[PDB]
């Protein structure tokens, strides 16, 4: 299966310089959009989805009444 991906990636036409940087920028934008989408969490109302601070445990003082609160991914 790895060799098939090898051939598929290789077969991409050797286009002029512009589209290479274009593809790099597109990948950057895709990753950034994915991160922005993921920074919000499963949220039902009737659930004060509080900030679980990574350090020190739960945020005993950060009591999330009804309101945006972006979870730092992996944090």
């Amino acid at each position: 299966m790895a060799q098939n991906l090898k051939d598929l990636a290789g077969r991409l036409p050797a286009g002029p310089r512009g589209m290479g940087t274009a593809l790099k920028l597109l990948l950057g934008a895709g990753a950034v959009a994915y991160g922005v989408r993921e920074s919000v969490f499963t949220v039902e109302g009737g659930h004060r989805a509080i900030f679980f601070n990574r350090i020190g445990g739960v945020q005993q003082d950060t009591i999330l009444a009804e309101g945006l609160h972006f979870r730092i991914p992996w944090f």
């Binding site: 790895a2 060799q3 991906l5 090898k6 290789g10 992996w74």
Partner: protein
């Protein structure tokens, strides 16, 4: 010249895929309310409390056991 570029790009892609697979296998999600315990078989169960947190578990050594 073209064939060499094809082969080199293929090798780089395969290496990238392998690295990504290893990196993905090196992470764990122990939901909160479950504080994790590193399942390290090098030097064991960590008195250093590696609880909640997707700490970088090396593969083949640290399997995430989810302790509630």
């Amino acid at each position: 010249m073209a064939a060499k570029v094809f082969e080199s790009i293929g090798k780089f892609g395969l290496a990238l895929a392998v690295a990504g697979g290893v990196v993905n296998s090196a992470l764990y999600n122990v939901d909160a309310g479950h504080r994790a315990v590193i399942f390290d078989r090098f030097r064991g169960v960590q008195d250093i409390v590696v609880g909640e947190g997707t700490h970088f578990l090396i593969p083949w050594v640290q399997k995430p056991i989810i302790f509630d």
